[PDB]
Amino acid sequence: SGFRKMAFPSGKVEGCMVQVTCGTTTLNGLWLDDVVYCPRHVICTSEDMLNPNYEDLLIRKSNHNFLVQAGNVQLRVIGHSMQNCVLKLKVDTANPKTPKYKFVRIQPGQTFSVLACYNGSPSGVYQCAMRPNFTIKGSFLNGMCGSVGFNIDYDCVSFCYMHHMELPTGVHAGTDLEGNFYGPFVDRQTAQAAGTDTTITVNVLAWLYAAVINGDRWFLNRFTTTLNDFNLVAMKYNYEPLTQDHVDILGPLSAQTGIAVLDMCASLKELLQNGMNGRTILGSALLEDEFTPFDVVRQCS
Amino acid sequence: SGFRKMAFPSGKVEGCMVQVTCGTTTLNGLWLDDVVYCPRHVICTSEDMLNPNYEDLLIRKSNHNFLVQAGNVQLRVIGHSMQNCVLKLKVDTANPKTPKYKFVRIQPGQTFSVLACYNGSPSGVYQCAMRPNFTIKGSFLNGMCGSVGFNIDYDCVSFCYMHHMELPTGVHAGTDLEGNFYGPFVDRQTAQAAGTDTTITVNVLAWLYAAVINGDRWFLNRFTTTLNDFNLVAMKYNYEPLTQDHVDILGPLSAQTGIAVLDMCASLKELLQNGMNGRTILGSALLEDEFTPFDVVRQCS
Numbered sequence A, B: 001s002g003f004r005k006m007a008f009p010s011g012k013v014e015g016c017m018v019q020v021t022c023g024t025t026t027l028n029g030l031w032l033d034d035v036v037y038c039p040r041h042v043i044c045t046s047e048d049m050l051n052p053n054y055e056d057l058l059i060r061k062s063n064h065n066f067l068v069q070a071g072n073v074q075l076r077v078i079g080h081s082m083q084n085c086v087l088k089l090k091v092d093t094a095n096p097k098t099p100k101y102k103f104v105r106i107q108p109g110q111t112f113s114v115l116a117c118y119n120g121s122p123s124g125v126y127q128c129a130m131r132p133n134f135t136i137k138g139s140f141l142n143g144m145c146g147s148v149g150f151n152i153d154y155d156c157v158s159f160c161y162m163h164h165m166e167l168p169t170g171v172h173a174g175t176d177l178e179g180n181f182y183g184p185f186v187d188r189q190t191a192q193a194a195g196t197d198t199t200i201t202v203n204v205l206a207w208l209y210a211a212v213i214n215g216d217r218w219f220l221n222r223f224t225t226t227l228n229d230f231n232l233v234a235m236k237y238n239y240e241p242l243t244q245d246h247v248d249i250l251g252p253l254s255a256q257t258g259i260a261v262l263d264m265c266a267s268l269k270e271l272l273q274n275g276m277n278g279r280t281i282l283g284s285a286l287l288e289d290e291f292t293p294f295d296v297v298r299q300c301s
Helices: A054-059 A201-213 A227-236 A244-249 A251-257 A261-274 A293-299 B054-059 B201-213 B227-236 B244-249 B251-257 B261-274 B293-299
Strands: A017-022 A025-032 A035-039 A066-070 A073-075 A077-083 A086-091 A101-103 A111-118 A121-129 A148-153 A156-166 A172-175 B017-022 B025-032 B035-039 B066-070 B073-075 B077-083 B086-091 B101-103 B111-118 B121-129 B148-153 B156-166 B172-175
Touching: A017 A035, A017 A121, A025 A066, A035 A156, A054 A077, A066 A077, A066 A086, A111 A156, A201 A244, A201 A251, A201 A261, A201 A293, A227 A261, A244 A251, A251 A261, A251 A293, B017 B035, B017 B121, B025 B066, B035 B156, B054 B077, B066 B077, B066 B086, B111 B156, B201 B244, B201 B251, B201 B261, B201 B293, B227 B261, B244 B251, B251 B261, B251 B293
Parallel strands: A101 A156, B101 B156
Antiparallel strands: A017 A025, A017 A066, A025 A035, A035 A086, A066 A073, A077 A086, A111 A121, A111 A148, A148 A156, A156 A172, B017 B025, B017 B066, B025 B035, B035 B086, B066 B073, B077 B086, B111 B121, B111 B148, B148 B156, B156 B172
């Protein structure tokens, strides 16, 4: 029993973290097989970041301009290339600690573990959600760029995030491992608008199910509702619309608890309309939306 | 920028997790050098747990009655002994993945990372606080007993917790690695009273300092107060008394922010007396007490 925000064990990812230095800039890199992945803005100076032509800046760099260091050992760079917003540094040595891995572009509302590193050294691990507006509410200091997000299915590590930028509002933006930014963000120091930060409705429901399983039942009401009726209320409180797919995904939790999804939806409606009246659910005084139905089932076997 | 509940990287601990099986019971063990540590109630059946004489139960067990398995490989048990509530199984092989480690009995209010494992396999990692009443609010399913809590100072792993029991109230109790229970708890299936769960005042203050550093300033008031005056208010809301030691520990955070500890104490007083009026601090609608001053400084470099 009990319910906590949990990351995956970071051991397999730790062994893939290296230090990439180019000129005077240092940040993190991901060493898989004979390739190191890092944010391309490693090549930029403070001044360049305002308006960088990455192609032109990359042309002034040769292989020997990239210092790749794995722990105490220096890797030989035998080729470089830019793939969207990440730099792929080819090295002569295959990482012996390379786990079985995929690169995965994850969907908004999905969760992953972040291994926060400083200049190639892992410092800690926490669980994140890719928010509907494609930002994350993480924790990244200077020299933590290139820190990666991942999920683990048994022996396979699915890397899904690389950290690149902190926006003027203090939320975080980044790419998949193919270098494509999540959301409309670019690797430039300008004012960048993140959209309205809507709540991940299916996750909130999953968490309410977790609550019931762990003996928090107070919020359960005598009402039910409909998809449309619920969604009217959802739009007002900036909740993502609930679809039949979302309903279907909650099925096992519905099955385990004996509470139909639409009944839980009605419970949520009253919580949105009346608040919590200073009570707590699973030790939180607000509605948590950074647990997927999978995360709940994982922890509520 | 940003502030998150972060665990230490679990890589060094993962490599020390093994499966211990005795009769029909299976749980986790900690393999360090040529010694495996596990909860002694591995020797108990469901029935034994009601009222076990561990000495008598241990006498019926020989070395070959303990199946110690590290991943796919079986370890040879060449000696066993009971040290308080943990079993020390001596094996013929030194763990090659043994990191530099200490055993440390931690103080109430201090934090640590928990690597939740199932039958020797790590499943996830989250940060805990040893609560003033010597319980933890963790997440442990069946076969997660023997999961360990630890801190990491550079290369050294300080193990401080082993999980043994879930109390009828659904909070968790356990031991240090010398097998001494935190709090008055025993490894027996009876009704066990945890005391009043007081709030860790110094941690709450540290978190408020973190808030200020990250731009949450709304709660800052025009008042100050005294240790005694503050503590009067602390006792009413079941907060730990604040001592000069606690004041001293907050000094660097006081120094960084320009806010004297007693001024922050006054801010906290008003928050306790008036609540939050439905606002949030660092994305929480209540006062967080599971970050130490060290945890804050670590994340707010």
